[PDB]
Amino acid sequence: IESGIAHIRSTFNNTIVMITDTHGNALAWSSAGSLGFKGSRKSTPFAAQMAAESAAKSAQEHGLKTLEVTVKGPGSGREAAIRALQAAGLEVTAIKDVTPVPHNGCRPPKRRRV
RNA sequence: GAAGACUGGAGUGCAGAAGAGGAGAGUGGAAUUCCACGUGUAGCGGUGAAAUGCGUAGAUAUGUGGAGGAACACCAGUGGCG
Ligand SMILES: [Mg+2]
Ligand SMILES: [Mg+2]
Ligand SMILES: [Mg+2]
Ligand SMILES: [Mg+2]
Ligand SMILES: [Mg+2]
Ligand SMILES: [Mg+2]
Incomplete structure (x- = not known):
């Protein structure tokens, strides 16, 4: 309406972009x-x-002059989409990294090719 | 072998120090999964490439609450203890 926020998840397989309130x-x-x-x-x-x-x-x-980008995921498609959103007219206020780092929670799936 | 003597081995006392040494009981945060709810539309997931798989009974993403289990990010270092 006036100032929403943008969510992005660019993993190694896909890039999903979100716009919310x-x-x-x-x-x-x-x-x-x-x-x-x-x-x-x-x-x-x-x-x-x-x-x-x-x-x-x-x-x-929907109508939005300002927004902020929250970047999650380790893939190679974050800066491109951030710049593309900023250069379409709406200025990105700030950028944050929201990768879910665990504090040694649960064991990850086994290493590949073994 | 016997009878004595000594403190440079060994042990006790006195004053300090460091430590993921062991056992029992109790609490903490981040994250994964499951459940419920509000917009939310056609895809999500995955590989060298795909398909199986999940998805219009409406998934992924998205914020708000609840349940449960397991392991303890930084400190962290040929550092410490046994
Ligand atoms: Mg001595
Ligand atoms: Mg939780
Ligand atoms: Mg699973
Ligand atoms: Mg959800
Ligand atoms: Mg939650
Ligand atoms: Mg020793």
């Missing part, structure tokens, strides 16, 4: 798979470019 309910979303990418083409920064553009440009109807 400041109290945190969904408005519009897009993904690298929604644009027609089949193989591992999702993980590229360019697929994140199209996802970010198509998600920010569809947030115009």
